[PDB]
Design a protein around this nucleic acid. Sequence first.
RNA 1: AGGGGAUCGAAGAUGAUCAGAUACCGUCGUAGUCUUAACCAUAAACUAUGCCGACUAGGGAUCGGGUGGUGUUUUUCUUAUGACCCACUCGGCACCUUACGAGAAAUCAAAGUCUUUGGGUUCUGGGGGGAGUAUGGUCGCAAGGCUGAAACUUAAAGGAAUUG
RNA 2: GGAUAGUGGCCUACCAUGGUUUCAACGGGUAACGGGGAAUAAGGGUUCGAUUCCGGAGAGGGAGCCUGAGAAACGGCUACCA
Lengths: 151, 129, 81, 144, 153, 25, 93
Amino acid sequence: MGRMHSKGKGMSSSAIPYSRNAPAWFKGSSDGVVEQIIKYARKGLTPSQIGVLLRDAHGVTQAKVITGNKILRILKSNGLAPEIPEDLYFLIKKAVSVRKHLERNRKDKDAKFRLILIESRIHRLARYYRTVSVLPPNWKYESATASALVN
Amino acid sequence: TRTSVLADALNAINNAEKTGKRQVLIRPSSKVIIKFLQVMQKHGYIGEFEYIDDHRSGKIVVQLNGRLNKCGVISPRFNVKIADVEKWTANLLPARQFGYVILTTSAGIMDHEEAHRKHVSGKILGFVY
Amino acid sequence: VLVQDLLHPTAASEARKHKLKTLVQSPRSHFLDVKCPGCLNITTVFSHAQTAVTCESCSTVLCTPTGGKAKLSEGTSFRRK
Amino acid sequence: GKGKPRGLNSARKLRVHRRNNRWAETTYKKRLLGTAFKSSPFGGSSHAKGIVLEKIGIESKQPNSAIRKCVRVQLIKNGKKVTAFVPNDGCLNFVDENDEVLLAGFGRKGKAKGDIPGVRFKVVKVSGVSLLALWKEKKEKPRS
Amino acid sequence: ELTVQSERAFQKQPHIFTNPKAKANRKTKRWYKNVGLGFKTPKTAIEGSYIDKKCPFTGLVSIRGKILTGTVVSTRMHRTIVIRRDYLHYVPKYNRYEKRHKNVPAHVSPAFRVQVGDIVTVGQCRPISKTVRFNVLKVASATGKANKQFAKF
Amino acid sequence: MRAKWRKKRTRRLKRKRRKVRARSK
Amino acid sequence: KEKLLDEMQDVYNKISQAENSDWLTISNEFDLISRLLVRAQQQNWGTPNIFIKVVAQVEDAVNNTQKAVARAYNTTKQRVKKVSRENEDSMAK
RNA sequence: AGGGGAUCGAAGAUGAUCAGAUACCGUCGUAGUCUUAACCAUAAACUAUGCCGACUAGGGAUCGGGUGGUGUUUUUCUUAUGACCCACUCGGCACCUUACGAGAAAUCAAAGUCUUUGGGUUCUGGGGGGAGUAUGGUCGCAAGGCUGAAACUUAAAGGAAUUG
RNA sequence: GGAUAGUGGCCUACCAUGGUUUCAACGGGUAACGGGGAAUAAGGGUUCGAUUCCGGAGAGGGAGCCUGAGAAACGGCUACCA
Ligand SMILES: [Mg+2]
Ligand SMILES: [Mg+2]
Ligand SMILES: [Mg+2]
Ligand SMILES: [Mg+2]
Ligand SMILES: [Mg+2]
Ligand SMILES: [Mg+2]
Ligand SMILES: [Mg+2]
Ligand SMILES: [Mg+2]
Ligand SMILES: [Mg+2]
Ligand SMILES: [Mg+2]
Ligand SMILES: [Mg+2]
Ligand SMILES: [Mg+2]
Ligand SMILES: [Mg+2]
Ligand SMILES: [Mg+2]
Ligand SMILES: [Mg+2]
Ligand SMILES: [Mg+2]
Ligand SMILES: [Mg+2]
Ligand SMILES: [Mg+2]
Ligand SMILES: [Mg+2]
Ligand SMILES: [Mg+2]
Ligand SMILES: [Mg+2]
Ligand SMILES: [Mg+2]
Ligand SMILES: [Mg+2]
Ligand SMILES: [Zn+2]
């Protein structure tokens, strides 16, 4: 219930069940599930979108419990993992959108404050990803490589 | 954030003993906390405690007996030579008749008397009496 | 309440408590076998479904998402999983 | 709690923190800056010799009504002029003009004491012989 | 780096002679010595062509005394390294520790490959320069995180 | 005085001192 | 924040004038320009064209063929090499 | 600096009281008050309570969200809403009673879990003045801000409550 | 390469642009010689250590040097400054 740059203390989260195996009611087999994952990834969706879709329209509670592996690992093994981790991509999209909004109208200071907060988040996450070497160690983000990446 | 899980545990047990409860729920569980509990149980300051698995982090339900008056963690796990342990047991434990400085040696997590008998010494974990 | 059995408390109490706070964490949502008015196809849908789940054969809005538990269509019929 | 760092590897911050807060004590600041040497009338010294320039009756503080007979003395060690008290009844007449007088501290850590304003130091010896011996007629001044 | 006596004077190992009249011409006889303390000479030293009179293997300097392990922090100087040694100094007034570091400049033979971030075992030797008192003996994590650079199953 | 007024009087004295310093330099 | 750019341009002009005659005060000018660049990089807006121009002028002054002036020459060569680590020289060309 | 220019209004102009009144009150009244770029970075910027954690005691309410109600009306014949009623839950401003703990208390459900003294952490203070002064740096166009002494002097200054 | 008894930017010729630092370099002060220890004393510390032992340095201030195994000596020299 801690927040990164706010005074909130929210408790909103996902509450994964105790069971480590497939539910007694699941009839589909894991191979069909992973094929579905790969076809959706080919469609061009992020792993979070894959998880939400497979939770809603199908009986996949979570892809790990039935396929034995995590969605990002599935895409990576079949070579569909994006060069940028998806959450960091969403951060960059938010940051470039805020940059554009600040460019259009200048006096708005609250967007500037939220922009510097976003830049802090991006710096932290990118530093972590560099540490795990997901990104190349040269990877650095200042102004315009953002507009290159988001497009 | 939650830095020392054992500090949380011992704070909970002390607060509930002062309040007058007979059982506590230590929310995050860890091996070191389990060993602390085994020591206190062997010496009798605790009744019958139970572990619960959650696939994320264990929970512990400790049945007290009111015999315990105060535990406590020495949060910076200081280094104590075999000589300074007497200074520590003079500083923390009320009287030399009873009270135990629970500390971790290479031989395991164990009180100060057993540690003296094995002639080993390590880092201090806490004090129970 | 100086003495109570935290290990096996009364079922109504745990069902009353908020999730993520019971003795063991277990979600309250569930899945549903829903039948569309159009065909005899049976589809599995999450309780708090976030997207407008539709039948694969025909485009029909089985569920309309909302803040919490998803809202089923009037014609569709649901069964607890 | 106790908002000072407490981890094992925080010796540096605690040490610098104590070194920095030690500047609050007046005694420590005096010792380190050497105020007892640079600016004090005595060079961190208990006694020093001097020459009487003239004699003054300083009026006491509020509740005390009297005149405390002091003498202005130019110190021979550095030349700073300073007033100094003379104890006991018949002692000012025992202090010759332009006479070798030895001064000591006045008993309050270099601060003015009692009802005497602005005077900070006693008189223990005059012209070699001490003042107490003269007051009790143990000895006679060398009148040199 | 294929320097091979590019400098003004010739770079010869002193008092090792090759007889041109000897009609073998099997390269040039190279002097090397095992340094002791259970340290194995690298094949780059034996099969190499550098000179490095200050090499602990193929030179004149000898290794005795201390054996220090550290991490390179600067390779940028020529034939020599700046190693950063970290340690915990104990302050008894508080029963605590400070993380302190010392910079030791050592000499690296061309027989080894050193890059910033490597962990290296070095040994004491005679005064080589004003600040160089050590010759590298072993480089462990030369490409510990650098072996894997691309990813495709 | 009020501490407010003491500060204001000191500020005016500082202003006069700076004027004198600028004249001297 | 135009004062920093104006001062950098004045420093570049002074460096060009000193090189016209050369490192007696050019070393101090380059040293102060380094601090100006550090201060500009401290804020969000940095790396102006004046800094690149001053760096190129210092490189030209050090390159020319040329007594404390020798310390100035060595220090200016080292400073030009260090500030030439930037790729902005490609922009200058 | 540029655009505004109603009210209000430091300075001022005055009309009265007053022993004096360039003060309180009454009329006017420039700068500002409102704006556009650039500065300034200070307030009793106060909850005079640093932040992040865990625990400890009951009570309703209130705001937002989510749950269930064979719930109440609604009305579009009725579902579905919405608005309400009941119960619970998460998070927030608070509030009420109480101490079993705390404090020197006034009081606090955090200022508790602190001699039975240790969850992680930054920043401050060491008697009152002298004084946030001198000096030196640095920022600022300026006003001033940040940093920041000492000599000397003093036996108290001060907090909370009690009776007069 | 020179020089040394010898290692060594110790020095020279040429070349490279490096070395240290917020884990406090560098600079300023020390009424600072360092250490063995002294006073103080619940435990923790605080201050002091010119001074009987061990090292370091100096013989007015600096410099240079003969001699001999050992000196940049000083109750040995040469020179300047006071
Ligand atoms: Mg841990
Ligand atoms: Mg009188
Ligand atoms: Mg105007
Ligand atoms: Mg007026
Ligand atoms: Mg008037
Ligand atoms: Mg008006
Ligand atoms: Mg303030
Ligand atoms: Mg405040
Ligand atoms: Mg605050
Ligand atoms: Mg004071
Ligand atoms: Mg003041
Ligand atoms: Mg100033
Ligand atoms: Mg007050
Ligand atoms: Mg009062
Ligand atoms: Mg040589
Ligand atoms: Mg000392
Ligand atoms: Mg000594
Ligand atoms: Mg000598
Ligand atoms: Mg003499
Ligand atoms: Mg002889
Ligand atoms: Mg001599
Ligand atoms: Mg002699
Ligand atoms: Mg002679
Ligand atoms: Zn359908």
